[PDB]
Design a protein around this ligand. Sequence first.
Ligand code: FE2
Ligand code: FE2
Lengths: 346, 346
Amino acid sequence: FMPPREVHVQVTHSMPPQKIEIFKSLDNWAEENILVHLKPVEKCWQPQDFLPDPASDGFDEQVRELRERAKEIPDDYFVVLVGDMITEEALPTYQTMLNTLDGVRDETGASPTSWAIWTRAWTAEENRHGDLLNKYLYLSGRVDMRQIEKTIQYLIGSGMDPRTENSPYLGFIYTSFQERATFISHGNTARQAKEHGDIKLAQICGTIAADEKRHETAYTKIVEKLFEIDPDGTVLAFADMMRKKISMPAHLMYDGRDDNLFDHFSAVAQRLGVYTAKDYADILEFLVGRWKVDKLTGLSAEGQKAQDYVCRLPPRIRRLEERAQGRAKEAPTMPFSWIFDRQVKL
Amino acid sequence: FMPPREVHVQVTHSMPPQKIEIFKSLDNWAEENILVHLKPVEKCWQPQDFLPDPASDGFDEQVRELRERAKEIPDDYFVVLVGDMITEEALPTYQTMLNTLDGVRDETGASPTSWAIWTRAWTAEENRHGDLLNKYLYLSGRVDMRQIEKTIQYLIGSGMDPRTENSPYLGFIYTSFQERATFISHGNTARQAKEHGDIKLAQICGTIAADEKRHETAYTKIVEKLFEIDPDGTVLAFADMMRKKISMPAHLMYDGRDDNLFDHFSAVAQRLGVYTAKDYADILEFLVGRWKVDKLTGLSAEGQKAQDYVCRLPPRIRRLEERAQGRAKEAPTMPFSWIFDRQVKL
Ligand SMILES: [Fe+2]
Ligand SMILES: [Fe+2]
């Protein structure tokens, strides 16, 4: 019953150590540019805002309406939603990931540094996503919670190596790409929940999307400054990540039944138009756009090629991955333990 | 609206670096002595096992029975249960904490080392506790979930510095003490749920207790080997931790309303006999017993005093903290946002 393992040689601490200082120097910069994308907790929504109120006489009719509505939502959607939700619940991993990063790590668990304050805050904000989606899914009755729980335990046990090699350059680029992927993801699960008549679920997805967009803005701003301070190392970092392809935090997903669970979940996501290969491209083009990569000049021999590769990658990735031919018609149907081994097209 | 902050100078990397090797050496030892307390995921219980089944015709009558029973459980209990639950949900922090530890850290997020495998697995096991208690509490309708959620967000944002200084010696002693504290905690919330007629909740707490006992056994076994390999550094570490007093992972608890929320939650917990100053002693006595600290001989000048301090501490802590006089009668009554500002004795 072994889950899938990371298949690539594991590289640690691949950024010149003499560069930690730049992040220690950037500390106050971060305090005034990042710790603003922090809504005070009192201002933040909480999951309870979107769920039946267990301390109200309303509770029953609310739970009943929730379920009544969930019937008009297809299984394929739920598979995607569930996958989405599982990714979210693997958060401990993700915090841990951010804390592998060399100049921006929380050395104690309660470090007073801007980098740490941000990490602990982002995590606290992120924690509400799992909770919300979880309970929603629980209440819905449309899904197999035990299999979903099992999946999550496998996932956290497995972890992820996003191949950031302990580099804040790579780490912050990764998360930049990452968070945008899930803004689109939820953006669409939201759009689609409305289309299937469930405004309250659309609201759940939409709010989660808003949160991921705010975080996107923050991590890009860190990278923007890195591009500004150290163009060379940064372009190099961006090209490195793209060469490796960004791998989603949930790729080692496993439910004890399906050895290609991630591939399969992603396929459904793609068929429904929730998150496509097309989007993956749109992300780094946006990112090449945002970081004005084309507008950079004066770099090292190695910088030249890195820039050009990263600038010219989206059109190629576009063609390469727009031949949905074998799979945008004769995709097989496949069971999913998350929905009691009911089946959906791939 | 600022939460409480850690009040002690933050010390990092206080273990001689030349000692990382001992943990790298201990790697295979850990694989055959620790990765056994790993029940395969398939064998593990999941939260759904203890909750109403949302995909059953039974769901309603189950939710109904759950709440009917929660009425016969007093508010003070719930305060304790909720605080217990919040501590649990601060898990991201705790994984992060274990990963601050120098020779036992996960360098990548999916490190193939025994130490990392254990950390990721322990975390995946621990994740179920929050989920379970959360949903239970949500269904119960006896508690204010929004205030609980808000508390959690503050908590994760705040984190904890358990003062382990990046030392696996200190880290593993901390978690050794820690996990035993919550085995007792849950042991008693369990006993007491039965006493108030809610067997299903007793089962929830009892199962969570079983998990923590398994983990206790593992972390003590790491420390046992450390005592065995390096008696000096270890006794020194144990005395250091005790001098500092072990601080619970949730001490910086805050709900936007009560500036001494931890103290207040702990007080209720003490009044109900869930976790007392008396217990805190019983833990390190058990630990001084378990690690046969008294039976050690041949140490350094500094080792002598460290051993004796640690051996003779529990009786003193016992007398010192058994004068529940000012507080084991005329404790004030106090509101708790976790229960809609209803009040309980302290
Ligand atoms: Fe998220
Ligand atoms: Fe626990």
